[PDB]
């Protein structure tokens, strides 16, 4: 037992910033951010990539979170400028550039997402683009 140092913080209306949107798509995958600082590709996260369109505003974004700890690792809005190009023929993963906000600070990271199977990638591709068709 250790006496607490900081005064007890009241509970919270545990948000989630989710809602007000609906899952236009949601599959788990692994995320990668490029380094440039070197040239190696880095593991950014593992969990569910979602595609949410606001109920009101109608603004579709791509929110990814990490399992276990649950932390955003993708947050940008899908744009018509973004083009999910394959990657070394890897029909299970794609790469696109995005002014992501996963850290709550805008950073123009080049990304890569890889899926367990191709069907899953294909579906992601479709739904992703279908979300641009709007």
């Amino acid at each position: 037992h250790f006496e607490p140092v900081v005064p007890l913080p009241d509970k919270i209306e545990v948000k989630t910033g989710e809602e007000d949107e609906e899952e236009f798509f949601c599959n788990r995958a692994k995320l990668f951010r490029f380094d440039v600082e070197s040239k190696e590709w880095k593991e950014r996260g593992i969990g569910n990539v979602k595609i949410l369109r606001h109920k009101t505003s109608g603004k579709i974004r791509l929110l990814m979170r990490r399992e276990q700890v649950l932390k955003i690792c993708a947050n940008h809005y899908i744009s018509p400028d973004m083009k999910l190009t394959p990657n070394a023929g890897s029909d299970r993963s794609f790469v696109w550039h995005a002014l992501d906000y996963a850290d709550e600070l805008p950073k123009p990271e080049q990304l890569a997402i890889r899926f367990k199977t191709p069907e899953e990638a294909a579906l992601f591709k479709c739904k992703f683009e279908e979300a641009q068709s709007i």
Partner: protein, 204 residues
């Protein structure tokens, strides 16, 4: 604002840095690059009683630093003592660190972590671990390579620090991002330079 000083100590090679740099980037550093006498990065965890920030003093391991790692210790509020489990030596030294800690800042919550439990050829067997029992320290198997339990350490501490035995980590407010329009040359170029990337084989 809720913040705590966390000093991560332990024989180099044990993964202390790889641990923290994963909770920070979600990246896994395969290569060894010794920490030159402490490095500090902050870690944030969103809980039911609000979010908390962990100021992590990722210290060095090579004894060549034995001196300075006392100032790193001043006013620390909790620490994670870590050892390799794949290198019994590390475990052997454990009791040493526990001392250095209780030297400058007595009591204080401390978690003992046996990292790398992802590797098959385990050497520091489960029943081998005992110090945590004799020293009354929360212990957990970790694996910065498989994220295995990698949150339990902080969670355990959080609770101790705050006072809510039931405090719990819970997702993370997915706040609204920034607005960036205009395609012109803008997105047209973003394309070219992107070639440089996808031309770099993907990890795994």
């Amino acid at each position: 604002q809720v913040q705590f000083k966390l000093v991560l100590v332990g024989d180099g090679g044990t993964g202390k840095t790889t641990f923290v740099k994963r909770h920070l980037t979600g990246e896994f550093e395969k290569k060894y690059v010794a920490t030159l006498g402490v490095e500090v990065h902050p870690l944030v965890f969103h809980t039911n009683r609000g979010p908390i920030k962990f100021n992590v003093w990722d210290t060095a391991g090579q004894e060549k630093f034995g001196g300075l790692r006392d100032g790193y210790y001043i006013q620390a509020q909790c620490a994670i003592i870590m050892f390799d489990v794949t290198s019994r030596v590390t475990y052997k030294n454990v009791p040493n660190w526990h001392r250095d800690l209780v030297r400058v800042c007595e009591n204080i919550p401390i978690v003992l972590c046996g990292n790398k439990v992802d590797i098959k050829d385990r050497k520091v067997k489960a029943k081998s671990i005992v110090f945590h029992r004799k020293k009354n320290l929360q212990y957990y198997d970790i694996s910065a390579k498989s994220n295995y339990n990698f949150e339990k350490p902080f969670l355990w501490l959080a609770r101790k620090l705050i006072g809510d035995p039931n405090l719990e980590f819970v997702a993370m407010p997915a706040l609204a991002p920034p607005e960036v329009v205009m395609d012109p040359a803008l997105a047209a170029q973003y394309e070219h330079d992107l070639e440089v990337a996808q031309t770099t084989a993907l990890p795994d």
